[PDB]
Structure 1
Amino acid sequence: MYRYEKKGPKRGVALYSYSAEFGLTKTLEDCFEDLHDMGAHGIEILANTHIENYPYPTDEWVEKWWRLCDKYEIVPVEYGNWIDSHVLGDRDLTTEESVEMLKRDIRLAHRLGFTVMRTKMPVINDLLEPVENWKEIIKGALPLAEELGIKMCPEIHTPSNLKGKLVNDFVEFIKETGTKNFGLNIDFSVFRTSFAEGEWVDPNYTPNKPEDIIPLLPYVYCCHAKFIHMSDDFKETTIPYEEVVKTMEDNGYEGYLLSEYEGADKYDEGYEVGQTLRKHHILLKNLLGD
């Protein structure tokens, strides 16, 4: 089992980037070797995309998975799941049904060696807040999660601000429970300052400053390194990357920053997202040292 023991922030990729390609031109192994070319070690997979025969893989497939991790020096970092209470059109799922589904994903994530879960929940308003019983769902799975060393993290992303209701309700919950197995995944779109002339921007979105993240880093277990555009000098032209990465270096972050690219040109013909990601990782390696 390969282990990556750089101190401080580490770089990785989220296979959501290979989204136009997966199952068409790249296989799961192609994605692993693509991360290898980059020197990237951390990975994020999506439960409903990258586990063959989900939700019940075979012992053969799981062992193939671990062989891939060893062969390409990949650390399972973050495992993206959904607790979809609204999966049924006619009714919500009871708290117990939601916990049974969550617990199941926690087991699979642990078996594949993951250590953070990026949990997405149905949303009930325009602040993107979770179903009202979310406290009850998470509290149902927290003992299993603590046993198996997993940390469940909802994702914070635009238009949500690092100091709006959504973040503080999660931080409040962590403090009241005292759990070290619930937390936050910050997606770098919350620091985005540059946009295109004529590009619509949610009137509710305000950029956060890189320092805005400092009081939350106690609760941040993994970050999506969102990025919009890489110059041919391998700089990111919409987010203060140097200042964000340095803030996190200086303030004790030891998690991963996983490349997430969501541009629509992903799906244009001829687009080579592997090249785009290599751009993003030239920047990331230069900022981190490895």
Structure 2
Amino acid sequence: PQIKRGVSLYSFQEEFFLRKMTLEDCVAACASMGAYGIESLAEQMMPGFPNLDDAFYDGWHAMMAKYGTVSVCHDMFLDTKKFRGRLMTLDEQVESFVRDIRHASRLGCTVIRVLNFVSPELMEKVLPHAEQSNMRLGLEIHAPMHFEHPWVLRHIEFMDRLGSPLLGFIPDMGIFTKHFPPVMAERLIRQGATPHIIEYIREQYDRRVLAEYVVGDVRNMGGNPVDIRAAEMLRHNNWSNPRRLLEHMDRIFHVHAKFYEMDEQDRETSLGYEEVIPVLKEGGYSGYLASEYEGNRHIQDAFEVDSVEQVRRHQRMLARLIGE
């Protein structure tokens, strides 16, 4: 009974983009669901970052208290390609990362979502700065990666050597994509995909057939460019072993409860919540599951987006599976 419910405000991006919900509107909706853990993206909803003033940070603290919510996680970004013709120097990357540690500290967070692409060497070099702010750094593991991917294995080598409890991981539930997501398949057909070939792709997805086989096969049976791009989604969405989480539980700081579609039954239609949540309980997980709605980008061409409703259903699903 120690798994906690939260929401990444990324879930409300469509309404925030359209100026239908403010930053505080998002937090309010979140508290109304009993999802008191808040995850935020300063570069998404806090214009003026990384130059936010004490009036903002004090106001965010007062907002959290007013709603009974907790500022849990800050999601950093790292624009290594900010300068045309080159990448940031390692020192420029450290400077950018320290920005986010400072901000997460002032926001009251206990963990930062470190982008999946961040190198072990950068994690190592910024560690003293994290230590000074007692800030956990959780590298996101998202599709098509998993805890046995060689990039993650190399990150683990570094964390084993450094021996710091502040370095760890944030699994994204898209590494538990059990079925080809329906809203993805449906948008592909709206874009002109061949329905017979989409059905082949969805079937082969469930069968766990190698991605490169499905791609070449769709090519070989005369798939159009949309069909081929549909097949190539198998390179970007994956199932992984849920019991592998048990090996890394001390480093699992936070979970991105990614979802695309909650049906009227309060069931998520493609991601492996019923397999993963029992494992987190078996492992003694005491962190947050933070709703991360991404259905908007797939349905927005033909349907109104209702992120609050989708997150309400998702939170009811989480509560049931946690055993509240």
The alignment's TM-score, normalised by the length of structure 1, stands at: 0.88
Q: 2: distance between equivalents of 1:181 and 1:168?
A: 17
Q: 2: distance between equivalents of 1:135 and 1:164?
A: 14
Greater percentage in helix:
2
Instruction: Give the residue type in structure 1 aligned to 2:311.
Output: L
8 Å Cα contact 1:214-1:247 kept in structure 2: yes
Match for 2:240 among 183, 208, 211?
208
- How far residue 259 of structure 1 moved from its aligned partner, in angstroms, is 0.5
Unaligned regions of 5+ residues in structure 2, if any? 183-198, 203-229
Match for 2:283 among 245, 251, 255?
251
Match for 1:189 among 161, 170, 174?
174
RMSD between aligned residues: 1.9
How many residues were matched structurally?
Answer: 274
- How far residue 52 of structure 1 moved from its aligned partner, in angstroms, is 3.6
Partner of 2:140: 155
Percent identity of paired positions between Structure 1 and Structure 2: 34
- How far residue 203 of structure 1 moved from its aligned partner, in angstroms, is 4.4
Q: 2: distance between equivalents of 1:267 and 1:44?
A: 23
Instruction: Give the residue type in structure 1 aligned to 2:95.
Output: E
1:120 and 2:120 equivalent? no
- How far residue 48 of structure 1 moved from its aligned partner, in angstroms, is 0.8
Answer with 1 or 2: which has the greater Rg: 2
1:89-108 CA-partner distances (Å, limit 9, x unpaired): 12221211111121121011
- Secondary structure in 1 aligned to 2:29? helix
Within 5 Å, which residues of 2 pair with 1:170-185?
170-185=155-170
Q: 1:228 to 1:91 in 2, by over 3 A?
A: same
Instruction: Give the residue type in structure 1 aligned to 2:61.
Output: W
8 Å Cα contact 2:36-2:70 kept in structure 1: yes
Within 5 Å, which residues of 2 pair with 1:271-290?
271-290=305-324
- How far residue 244 of structure 1 moved from its aligned partner, in angstroms, is 0.7
Partner of 2:72: 77
Within 5 Å, which residues of 2 pair with 1:45-56?
45-56=40-51
Q: 1: distance between equivalents of 2:41 and 2:268?
A: 25
Match for 1:217 among 249, 257, 271?
249
- How far residue 266 of structure 1 moved from its aligned partner, in angstroms, is 5.9
Q: 2: distance between equivalents of 1:257 and 1:37?
A: 17
8 Å Cα contact 1:265-1:271 kept in structure 2: no
8 Å Cα contact 2:12-2:307 kept in structure 1: yes
8 Å Cα contact 1:44-1:79 kept in structure 2: yes
Within 5 Å, which residues of 2 pair with 1:84-95?
84-95=79-90
- Secondary structure in 2 aligned to 1:114? coil
Q: 2: distance between equivalents of 1:50 and 1:143?
A: 28
Q: 1:55 to 1:234 in 2, by over 3 A?
A: same
The farther-off stretch of 154-163 and 105-114 is 154-163
Q: 1: distance between equivalents of 2:27 and 2:299?
A: 19
- How far residue 208 of structure 1 moved from its aligned partner, in angstroms, is 1.1
Q: 1: distance between equivalents of 2:35 and 2:9?
A: 12
- Secondary structure in 1 aligned to 2:291? strand
Partner of 1:60: 55
Instruction: Give the residue type in structure 1 aligned to 2:316.
Output: I
Q: 2: distance between equivalents of 1:266 and 1:162?
A: 30
Q: 1:148 to 1:222 in 2, by over 3 A?
A: same
8 Å Cα contact 2:136-2:168 kept in structure 1: yes
